[PDB]
Amino acid sequence: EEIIWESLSVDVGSQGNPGIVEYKGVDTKTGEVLFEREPIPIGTNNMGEFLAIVHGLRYLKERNSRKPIYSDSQTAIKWVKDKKAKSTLVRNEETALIWKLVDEAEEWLNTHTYETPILKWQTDKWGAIKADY
RNA sequence: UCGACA
DNA sequence: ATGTCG
Ligand SMILES: [Mg+2]
Ligand SMILES: [Mg+2]
Structure with a gap:
């Protein structure tokens, strides 16, 4: 019910599905872009959402951050x-x-640990996720 | 198929 | 329209 502003929000940007896919992670509070993936010529929306979350996990772990990650992707959250x-x-x-x-991405996941909560961004209540393109 | 998330 | 889950 409460938005945890002290968090990282990720999202995919696509052109076609399957189509060009890219993703980015931003500070949920300030909107500051923290990372962006070079566009991949062909991929699906869900694959990009998955990659965005895993990259987010790696990004936070490298910086010893315990902040949670928001994704609006039901699919990607389950995959992770x-x-x-x-x-x-x-x-x-x-x-x-x-x-x-x-x-x-799957490989990294099976060889590393993390406690990062992966939360569903409730778009129907809070509007577009902050990492939206 | 229906419901849902994109 | 296409990708996925419950
Ligand atoms: Mg999305
Ligand atoms: Mg969106």
Whole structure:
């Protein structure tokens, strides 16, 4: 019910789905952009949302921050929780990059620890997530 | 299919 | 329209 302003918010920006995917993380309070991923030619919205959360986890861990992460992606939150991105995107030559990033994200997750709460941003009550494009 | 999150 | 979960 309460927005934890002392947090990191992430979100994906896409052009087509499957289509070009990029993502960024911002300070929920100030909107300051803390990180951005170079656009990936082909990927799905959910894969980008997943990557955004995992990158967020790595970003906070490297800085010893215990701040939670907000994502408005039901799918990505579950994937991170299970440490498994159950994407249906075909694995082929043009989806090689997004899949490599997804695979490496899962890999990091299974080899590192964190207590970072991953919270659902309630868009229907609070409006667009702060990392929205 | 329905409901939901994008 | 397309990607995913409950
Ligand atoms: Mg989103
Ligand atoms: Mg949005």
